[PDB]
Amino acid sequence: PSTIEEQAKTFLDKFNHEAEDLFYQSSLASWNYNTNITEENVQNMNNAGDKWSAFLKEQSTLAQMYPLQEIQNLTVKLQLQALQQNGSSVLSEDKSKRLNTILNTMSTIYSTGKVCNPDNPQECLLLEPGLNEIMANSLDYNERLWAWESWRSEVGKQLRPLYEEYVVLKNEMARANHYEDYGDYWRGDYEVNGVDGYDYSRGQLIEDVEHTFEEIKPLYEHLHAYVRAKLMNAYPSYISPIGCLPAHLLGDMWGRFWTNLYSLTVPFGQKPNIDVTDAMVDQAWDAQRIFKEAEKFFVSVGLPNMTQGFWENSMLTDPGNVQKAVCHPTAWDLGKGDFRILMCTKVTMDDFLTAHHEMGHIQYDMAYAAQPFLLRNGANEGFHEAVGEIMSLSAATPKHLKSIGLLSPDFQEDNETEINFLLKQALTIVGTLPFTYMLEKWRWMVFKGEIPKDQWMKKWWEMKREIVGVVEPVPHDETYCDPASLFHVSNDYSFIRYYTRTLYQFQFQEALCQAAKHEGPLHKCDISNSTEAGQKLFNMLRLGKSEPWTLALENVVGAKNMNVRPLLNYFEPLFTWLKDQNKNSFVGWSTDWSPYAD
Amino acid sequence: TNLCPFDEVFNATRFASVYAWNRKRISNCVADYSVLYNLAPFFTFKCYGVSPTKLNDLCFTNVYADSFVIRGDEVRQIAPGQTGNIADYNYKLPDDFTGCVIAWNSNKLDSKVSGNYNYLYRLFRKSNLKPFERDISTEIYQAGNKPCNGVAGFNCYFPLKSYSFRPTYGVGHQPYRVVVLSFELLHAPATVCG
Ligand SMILES: *[C@@H]1O[C@H](CO)[C@@H](O[C@@H]2O[C@H](CO)[C@@H](O)[C@H](O)[C@H]2NC(C)=O)[C@H](O[C@@H]2O[C@@H](C)[C@@H](O)[C@@H](O)[C@@H]2O)[C@H]1NC(C)=O
Ligand SMILES: *[C@@H]1O[C@H](CO)[C@@H](O)[C@H](O)[C@H]1NC(C)=O
Ligand SMILES: *[C@@H]1O[C@H](CO)[C@@H](O)[C@H](O)[C@H]1NC(C)=O
Ligand SMILES: *[C@@H]1O[C@H](CO)[C@@H](O)[C@H](O)[C@H]1NC(C)=O
Ligand SMILES: *[C@@H]1O[C@H](CO)[C@@H](O)[C@H](O)[C@H]1NC(C)=O
Ligand SMILES: [Cl-]
Ligand SMILES: [Zn+2]
């Protein structure tokens, strides 16, 4: 007599063996292309990738013939559910094809969209590098305005009809899988059922995101007020002391991060910044040494060294000029004990921190390789990135840099270099939080039906002005689709992951630094040499996604939910500084001013 | 007084799959077991019962040499009182085992870039193996409660799975060659010495 649970276990054992081999061939084929861009390697990548997708669809369908309702073992149930999500294959074949066409057309418009200067019809720019170089480096108001506007009017207007059809089909797919819409389907990533004390509902994520966003508002308003005041000094005729910031003056194509405003906003503009690039060059470091130092970092907290295969098979430098490579830094888990990093490493401080971030992913990947295939991931979509981020926090601190001999002991840390550092951090980390929440709230509301088609762009800019404190420099009607002018929206990726990641990373860093007995402000903390910190982290890393993410979080930080207090703790010295700087300024924004309303 | 043909066991070009493990019976020869304690890189040895130095001055009636290939991760199962796919379904050592297990990494010989599918292991079986039992049957494993009639399908699995050996696998997934030495003392005279 053979139960369904016993039948499921046996089915998963077969799947695990077949999956691991087919996935390795796809991952390795992907590797050979990204490291050696040739027409031949595109084919092999697509052949092995297609064999992998075809196996998955076959195994998803076979998996559905075991009912979840009749499984008690939760780790079996989790694996069955993850393979059983057939996604697009719940639609008719006609609608699957329509949707996949739409997705592909939106993706290639985004990546091949071009604007041409209205002086030369043949001198044209793509987003990358052309328009992005304008938006991160230009100080000229009209040049930035031209890039911002023509990107949204040339490419975004193309995506508007496609995006309308994408919502309809994604909602049909979501509703046929018994979610209430595609947004609810995305929030499914945080769902936990059947584990008493650790359950978490899809609707609870909206509540926790909004409740935590309220507590971030005061720090954001003061950051916004300080930035607006400094830009008002640079652009006196373009910025109102009570209005929103114009959306094309934020340092990238969307105002997604405010990193590049640093040079116009640096609080103490003559204090030396910390850049250890010149010391690395003086000391003859290469890519090898950087990754050796990052390995020394994780070993010092009790995690393993890198495998022998990691050193032999990774690509840590640009492969010369004969072969071309995709140089975006990525950590690779191919299975079968094979872990690699791809990175076109230059001898700079940024690439030193990036090496630590990327090796953090590998550390996460190695620790859960003992889980079954389908549980080998971060506990939820925000965990992996959070693990990467906290590695670069420690590696960049003056304490760590002095410790490894890249920073002179005679370097003097004071009030002011910390305020400068914290401001630069805040421009990246805190400035993106209202951008990220606002964008995802808009998509959620569109998928729910709360924003009719004829009010998409109207509601987008009302929410930009009201939540983000940013205003469009040119009125946009409904022929526009400005959200889709951002990669993640037109390439069909969930976005709240950048919000939850940011809260997780300071929760992790606060927990680890307490375990490391760190003295003083949280932002000066280096967890190096703390085997207690390394162990506490490892107890969550090895879980993969075998446990509810709420439990995984409790393991590191002793609390079951996302929490803003550690983030505010990290930025408290800046917050009190901003509050005192702003005592002569207006804090907050009026939504009715705009650059074009005169 | 001929020398014991261990060379054709250890230096053999191709080992058996562990589900179909190979046994060579030794007789009427003199073995110098101190030939081990040497070739330190990736040769590991673990004896159960009597020291290698001490049995080189000892005589047995029959010696058996069992050889096969498994993943590095799985070598720990070639040991008494262990469980897992290998110890349950492919090669099982008895609780009261009185012999030696030699293992070495053979990535250079048993993996290739397209994947070596020469080596198989048994993944499903109704019951566990009795010690030193071999099962080479290829009958379709019945997981469900319908007969399979000899074709793979839903709940009907071919029970032999291929390792996939590629040279870029981690050490735990690389191939290891294993030799298992059993020594027995029956009523008949001893003919294997040192
Ligand atoms: C859910 O199914 C799992 C796999 O079928 C169980 O794990 C297996 O438990 C066996 C107990 O006899 C053990 O030999 C196996 O090695 C182990 N396999 C794996 C991959 O872990 C699991 O049982 C729990 O987990 C193991 C580690 C032991 O601690 C058991 O005593 C546990 O009950 C099953 N869980 C439940 C709640 O039934
Ligand atoms: C790059 O790819 C080509 C064919 O795709 C191959 O012949 C060549 O050896 C590769 N180069 C390296 C360094 O692997
Ligand atoms: C990793 O650390 C262990 C412990 O010292 C050591 O034996 C092993 O050889 C190290 N691995 C490498 C590749 O150095
Ligand atoms: C970690 O320990 C080593 C050995 O004492 C030391 O050289 C290094 O500076 C330590 N790092 C920190 C940050 O204290
Ligand atoms: C296997 O071959 C090597 C090299 O020819 C030799 O040193 C070794 O002794 C051989 N093995 C046995 C068991 O004789
Ligand atoms: Cl926009
Ligand atoms: Zn990352």
PDB file of C-alpha atoms in Angstrom, chain A residues 289-471:
ATOM      1  CA  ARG A 289      44.913  39.637  -4.211  1.00  0.00           C
ATOM      2  CA  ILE A 290      41.487  41.290  -3.939  1.00  0.00           C
ATOM      3  CA  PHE A 291      39.681  37.958  -3.948  1.00  0.00           C
ATOM      4  CA  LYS A 292      42.274  36.498  -1.581  1.00  0.00           C
ATOM      5  CA  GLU A 293      41.521  39.329   0.848  1.00  0.00           C
ATOM      6  CA  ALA A 294      37.765  38.758   0.592  1.00  0.00           C
ATOM      7  CA  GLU A 295      38.355  35.062   1.222  1.00  0.00           C
ATOM      8  CA  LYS A 296      40.460  35.973   4.257  1.00  0.00           C
ATOM      9  CA  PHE A 297      37.464  38.052   5.379  1.00  0.00           C
ATOM     10  CA  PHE A 298      34.985  35.180   5.481  1.00  0.00           C
ATOM     11  CA  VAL A 299      37.532  32.733   6.892  1.00  0.00           C
ATOM     12  CA  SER A 300      38.117  35.166   9.777  1.00  0.00           C
ATOM     13  CA  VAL A 301      34.479  34.687  10.862  1.00  0.00           C
ATOM     14  CA  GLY A 302      34.574  30.888  10.561  1.00  0.00           C
ATOM     15  CA  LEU A 303      33.056  30.319   7.123  1.00  0.00           C
ATOM     16  CA  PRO A 304      34.908  28.079   4.647  1.00  0.00           C
ATOM     17  CA  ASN A 305      37.560  29.095   2.180  1.00  0.00           C
ATOM     18  CA  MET A 306      36.771  28.999  -1.507  1.00  0.00           C
ATOM     19  CA  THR A 307      36.843  25.650  -3.292  1.00  0.00           C
ATOM     20  CA  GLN A 308      39.783  24.618  -5.451  1.00  0.00           C
ATOM     21  CA  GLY A 309      37.444  24.843  -8.427  1.00  0.00           C
ATOM     22  CA  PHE A 310      36.567  28.446  -7.614  1.00  0.00           C
ATOM     23  CA  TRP A 311      40.125  29.647  -8.255  1.00  0.00           C
ATOM     24  CA  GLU A 312      40.708  27.549 -11.380  1.00  0.00           C
ATOM     25  CA  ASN A 313      37.342  28.100 -13.112  1.00  0.00           C
ATOM     26  CA  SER A 314      36.331  31.657 -12.207  1.00  0.00           C
ATOM     27  CA  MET A 315      37.050  34.610 -14.448  1.00  0.00           C
ATOM     28  CA  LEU A 316      38.315  37.433 -12.258  1.00  0.00           C
ATOM     29  CA  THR A 317      39.931  39.658 -14.910  1.00  0.00           C
ATOM     30  CA  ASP A 318      38.817  40.915 -18.306  1.00  0.00           C
ATOM     31  CA  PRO A 319      40.010  38.155 -20.741  1.00  0.00           C
ATOM     32  CA  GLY A 320      42.076  40.517 -22.808  1.00  0.00           C
ATOM     33  CA  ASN A 321      40.650  41.768 -26.086  1.00  0.00           C
ATOM     34  CA  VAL A 322      40.406  38.767 -28.437  1.00  0.00           C
ATOM     35  CA  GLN A 323      37.455  37.308 -26.510  1.00  0.00           C
ATOM     36  CA  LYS A 324      34.670  39.608 -25.314  1.00  0.00           C
ATOM     37  CA  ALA A 325      32.738  39.094 -22.094  1.00  0.00           C
ATOM     38  CA  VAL A 326      29.638  40.315 -20.278  1.00  0.00           C
ATOM     39  CA  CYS A 327      31.311  42.232 -17.453  1.00  0.00           C
ATOM     40  CA  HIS A 328      28.394  42.734 -15.064  1.00  0.00           C
ATOM     41  CA  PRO A 329      29.662  41.162 -11.788  1.00  0.00           C
ATOM     42  CA  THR A 330      27.804  37.948 -10.942  1.00  0.00           C
ATOM     43  CA  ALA A 331      28.210  35.009  -8.559  1.00  0.00           C
ATOM     44  CA  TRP A 332      27.461  31.608 -10.143  1.00  0.00           C
ATOM     45  CA  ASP A 333      26.126  28.441  -8.491  1.00  0.00           C
ATOM     46  CA  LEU A 334      26.130  25.738 -11.167  1.00  0.00           C
ATOM     47  CA  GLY A 335      25.507  22.772  -8.884  1.00  0.00           C
ATOM     48  CA  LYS A 336      27.680  19.712  -8.382  1.00  0.00           C
ATOM     49  CA  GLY A 337      29.970  21.639  -6.040  1.00  0.00           C
ATOM     50  CA  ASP A 338      30.910  24.105  -8.796  1.00  0.00           C
ATOM     51  CA  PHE A 339      30.942  27.767  -7.698  1.00  0.00           C
ATOM     52  CA  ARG A 340      32.391  30.668  -9.676  1.00  0.00           C
ATOM     53  CA  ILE A 341      32.530  34.440  -9.837  1.00  0.00           C
ATOM     54  CA  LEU A 342      32.548  36.359 -13.115  1.00  0.00           C
ATOM     55  CA  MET A 343      33.993  39.853 -12.734  1.00  0.00           C
ATOM     56  CA  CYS A 344      36.113  42.111 -14.934  1.00  0.00           C
ATOM     57  CA  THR A 345      38.036  43.264 -11.889  1.00  0.00           C
ATOM     58  CA  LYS A 346      39.967  46.532 -11.912  1.00  0.00           C
ATOM     59  CA  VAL A 347      42.347  47.484  -9.072  1.00  0.00           C
ATOM     60  CA  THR A 348      40.041  49.987  -7.344  1.00  0.00           C
ATOM     61  CA  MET A 349      38.244  50.337  -4.012  1.00  0.00           C
ATOM     62  CA  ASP A 350      34.797  49.870  -5.559  1.00  0.00           C
ATOM     63  CA  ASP A 351      35.816  46.543  -7.092  1.00  0.00           C
ATOM     64  CA  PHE A 352      37.344  45.518  -3.758  1.00  0.00           C
ATOM     65  CA  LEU A 353      33.989  46.029  -2.033  1.00  0.00           C
ATOM     66  CA  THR A 354      32.144  44.408  -4.949  1.00  0.00           C
ATOM     67  CA  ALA A 355      34.332  41.325  -4.598  1.00  0.00           C
ATOM     68  CA  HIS A 356      33.228  41.005  -0.957  1.00  0.00           C
ATOM     69  CA  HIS A 357      29.591  41.475  -1.911  1.00  0.00           C
ATOM     70  CA  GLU A 358      29.800  38.892  -4.680  1.00  0.00           C
ATOM     71  CA  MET A 359      31.727  36.384  -2.575  1.00  0.00           C
ATOM     72  CA  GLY A 360      28.985  36.803   0.053  1.00  0.00           C
ATOM     73  CA  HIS A 361      26.521  35.304  -2.439  1.00  0.00           C
ATOM     74  CA  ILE A 362      28.872  32.353  -3.005  1.00  0.00           C
ATOM     75  CA  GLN A 363      29.079  31.913   0.760  1.00  0.00           C
ATOM     76  CA  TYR A 364      25.263  31.788   0.796  1.00  0.00           C
ATOM     77  CA  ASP A 365      25.263  29.330  -2.116  1.00  0.00           C
ATOM     78  CA  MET A 366      27.819  26.972  -0.573  1.00  0.00           C
ATOM     79  CA  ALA A 367      26.034  26.873   2.792  1.00  0.00           C
ATOM     80  CA  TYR A 368      22.734  25.626   1.379  1.00  0.00           C
ATOM     81  CA  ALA A 369      24.130  23.221  -1.244  1.00  0.00           C
ATOM     82  CA  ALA A 370      23.206  20.351   1.109  1.00  0.00           C
ATOM     83  CA  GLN A 371      19.482  21.227   0.807  1.00  0.00           C
ATOM     84  CA  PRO A 372      17.502  19.445  -1.940  1.00  0.00           C
ATOM     85  CA  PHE A 373      17.623  21.135  -5.348  1.00  0.00           C
ATOM     86  CA  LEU A 374      14.378  23.096  -5.055  1.00  0.00           C
ATOM     87  CA  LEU A 375      15.150  24.537  -1.621  1.00  0.00           C
ATOM     88  CA  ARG A 376      18.507  26.007  -2.740  1.00  0.00           C
ATOM     89  CA  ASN A 377      17.705  29.714  -2.610  1.00  0.00           C
ATOM     90  CA  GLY A 378      17.502  32.699  -0.321  1.00  0.00           C
ATOM     91  CA  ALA A 379      14.814  32.428   2.321  1.00  0.00           C
ATOM     92  CA  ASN A 380      12.799  34.977   0.308  1.00  0.00           C
ATOM     93  CA  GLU A 381      13.537  37.282  -2.623  1.00  0.00           C
ATOM     94  CA  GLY A 382      15.238  39.870  -0.431  1.00  0.00           C
ATOM     95  CA  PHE A 383      17.666  37.659   1.552  1.00  0.00           C
ATOM     96  CA  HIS A 384      20.457  37.011  -0.978  1.00  0.00           C
ATOM     97  CA  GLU A 385      21.060  40.678  -1.771  1.00  0.00           C
ATOM     98  CA  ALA A 386      20.974  41.557   1.930  1.00  0.00           C
ATOM     99  CA  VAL A 387      23.745  39.015   2.620  1.00  0.00           C
ATOM    100  CA  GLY A 388      25.811  40.535  -0.190  1.00  0.00           C
ATOM    101  CA  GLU A 389      25.294  44.087   1.077  1.00  0.00           C
ATOM    102  CA  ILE A 390      26.376  43.578   4.681  1.00  0.00           C
ATOM    103  CA  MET A 391      29.735  42.191   3.485  1.00  0.00           C
ATOM    104  CA  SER A 392      30.626  45.475   1.796  1.00  0.00           C
ATOM    105  CA  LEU A 393      29.468  47.449   4.861  1.00  0.00           C
ATOM    106  CA  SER A 394      32.161  45.850   7.029  1.00  0.00           C
ATOM    107  CA  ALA A 395      34.839  45.743   4.324  1.00  0.00           C
ATOM    108  CA  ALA A 396      34.646  49.490   3.663  1.00  0.00           C
ATOM    109  CA  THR A 397      34.923  50.766   7.246  1.00  0.00           C
ATOM    110  CA  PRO A 398      38.081  52.646   8.259  1.00  0.00           C
ATOM    111  CA  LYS A 399      38.680  50.012  10.936  1.00  0.00           C
ATOM    112  CA  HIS A 400      38.760  47.209   8.380  1.00  0.00           C
ATOM    113  CA  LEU A 401      40.833  49.169   5.837  1.00  0.00           C
ATOM    114  CA  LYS A 402      43.401  50.171   8.460  1.00  0.00           C
ATOM    115  CA  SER A 403      43.447  46.560   9.644  1.00  0.00           C
ATOM    116  CA  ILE A 404      44.444  45.173   6.215  1.00  0.00           C
ATOM    117  CA  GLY A 405      47.025  47.911   5.661  1.00  0.00           C
ATOM    118  CA  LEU A 406      45.304  49.898   2.883  1.00  0.00           C
ATOM    119  CA  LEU A 407      44.636  52.925   5.083  1.00  0.00           C
ATOM    120  CA  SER A 408      47.249  54.810   7.029  1.00  0.00           C
ATOM    121  CA  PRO A 409      46.764  54.481  10.794  1.00  0.00           C
ATOM    122  CA  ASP A 410      47.344  58.261  10.738  1.00  0.00           C
ATOM    123  CA  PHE A 411      43.997  58.776   8.938  1.00  0.00           C
ATOM    124  CA  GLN A 412      41.818  60.879  11.214  1.00  0.00           C
ATOM    125  CA  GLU A 413      38.146  59.993  11.595  1.00  0.00           C
ATOM    126  CA  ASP A 414      36.012  62.811  13.005  1.00  0.00           C
ATOM    127  CA  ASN A 415      32.451  64.150  13.129  1.00  0.00           C
ATOM    128  CA  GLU A 416      32.675  65.454   9.613  1.00  0.00           C
ATOM    129  CA  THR A 417      34.042  62.550   7.552  1.00  0.00           C
ATOM    130  CA  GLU A 418      31.356  60.402   9.195  1.00  0.00           C
ATOM    131  CA  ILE A 419      28.638  62.890   8.258  1.00  0.00           C
ATOM    132  CA  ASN A 420      29.987  62.912   4.678  1.00  0.00           C
ATOM    133  CA  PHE A 421      30.013  59.121   4.542  1.00  0.00           C
ATOM    134  CA  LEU A 422      26.547  58.840   6.061  1.00  0.00           C
ATOM    135  CA  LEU A 423      25.129  61.390   3.590  1.00  0.00           C
ATOM    136  CA  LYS A 424      26.592  59.488   0.643  1.00  0.00           C
ATOM    137  CA  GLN A 425      25.175  56.252   2.035  1.00  0.00           C
ATOM    138  CA  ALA A 426      21.797  57.896   2.572  1.00  0.00           C
ATOM    139  CA  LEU A 427      21.622  59.231  -1.007  1.00  0.00           C
ATOM    140  CA  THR A 428      21.838  55.642  -2.230  1.00  0.00           C
ATOM    141  CA  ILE A 429      20.030  53.648   0.471  1.00  0.00           C
ATOM    142  CA  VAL A 430      17.426  56.046   1.853  1.00  0.00           C
ATOM    143  CA  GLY A 431      16.708  57.977  -1.342  1.00  0.00           C
ATOM    144  CA  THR A 432      15.656  54.783  -3.108  1.00  0.00           C
ATOM    145  CA  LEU A 433      13.142  53.744  -0.429  1.00  0.00           C
ATOM    146  CA  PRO A 434      10.295  56.106  -1.441  1.00  0.00           C
ATOM    147  CA  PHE A 435      11.137  55.503  -5.081  1.00  0.00           C
ATOM    148  CA  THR A 436      10.869  51.745  -4.599  1.00  0.00           C
ATOM    149  CA  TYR A 437       7.726  51.770  -2.440  1.00  0.00           C
ATOM    150  CA  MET A 438       5.948  54.288  -4.697  1.00  0.00           C
ATOM    151  CA  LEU A 439       6.698  52.320  -7.887  1.00  0.00           C
ATOM    152  CA  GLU A 440       5.528  49.009  -6.464  1.00  0.00           C
ATOM    153  CA  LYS A 441       2.419  50.588  -4.935  1.00  0.00           C
ATOM    154  CA  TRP A 442       1.512  51.877  -8.398  1.00  0.00           C
ATOM    155  CA  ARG A 443       1.912  48.439 -10.001  1.00  0.00           C
ATOM    156  CA  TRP A 444      -0.030  46.800  -7.169  1.00  0.00           C
ATOM    157  CA  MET A 445      -2.889  49.267  -7.637  1.00  0.00           C
ATOM    158  CA  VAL A 446      -2.853  48.789 -11.431  1.00  0.00           C
ATOM    159  CA  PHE A 447      -3.043  45.006 -11.033  1.00  0.00           C
ATOM    160  CA  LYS A 448      -5.809  45.338  -8.421  1.00  0.00           C
ATOM    161  CA  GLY A 449      -7.850  47.524 -10.771  1.00  0.00           C
ATOM    162  CA  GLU A 450      -7.760  50.598  -8.550  1.00  0.00           C
ATOM    163  CA  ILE A 451      -6.336  52.812 -11.345  1.00  0.00           C
ATOM    164  CA  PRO A 452      -8.289  52.858 -14.635  1.00  0.00           C
ATOM    165  CA  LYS A 453      -6.281  52.976 -17.868  1.00  0.00           C
ATOM    166  CA  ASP A 454      -7.171  56.617 -18.530  1.00  0.00           C
ATOM    167  CA  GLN A 455      -5.547  57.643 -15.227  1.00  0.00           C
ATOM    168  CA  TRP A 456      -2.309  55.622 -15.257  1.00  0.00           C
ATOM    169  CA  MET A 457       0.057  58.514 -15.870  1.00  0.00           C
ATOM    170  CA  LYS A 458      -2.135  60.895 -13.898  1.00  0.00           C
ATOM    171  CA  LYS A 459      -1.911  58.651 -10.847  1.00  0.00           C
ATOM    172  CA  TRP A 460       1.786  57.957 -11.423  1.00  0.00           C
ATOM    173  CA  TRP A 461       2.722  61.640 -11.167  1.00  0.00           C
ATOM    174  CA  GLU A 462       0.300  62.363  -8.322  1.00  0.00           C
ATOM    175  CA  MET A 463       2.036  59.559  -6.424  1.00  0.00           C
ATOM    176  CA  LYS A 464       5.492  60.758  -7.493  1.00  0.00           C
ATOM    177  CA  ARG A 465       4.746  64.244  -6.169  1.00  0.00           C
ATOM    178  CA  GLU A 466       2.969  63.119  -3.024  1.00  0.00           C
ATOM    179  CA  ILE A 467       5.102  60.185  -1.775  1.00  0.00           C
ATOM    180  CA  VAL A 468       8.479  60.683  -3.433  1.00  0.00           C
ATOM    181  CA  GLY A 469       8.506  64.500  -3.423  1.00  0.00           C
ATOM    182  CA  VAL A 470       9.530  64.486  -7.095  1.00  0.00           C
ATOM    183  CA  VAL A 471       7.762  66.323  -9.937  1.00  0.00           C
TER     184      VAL A 471
END
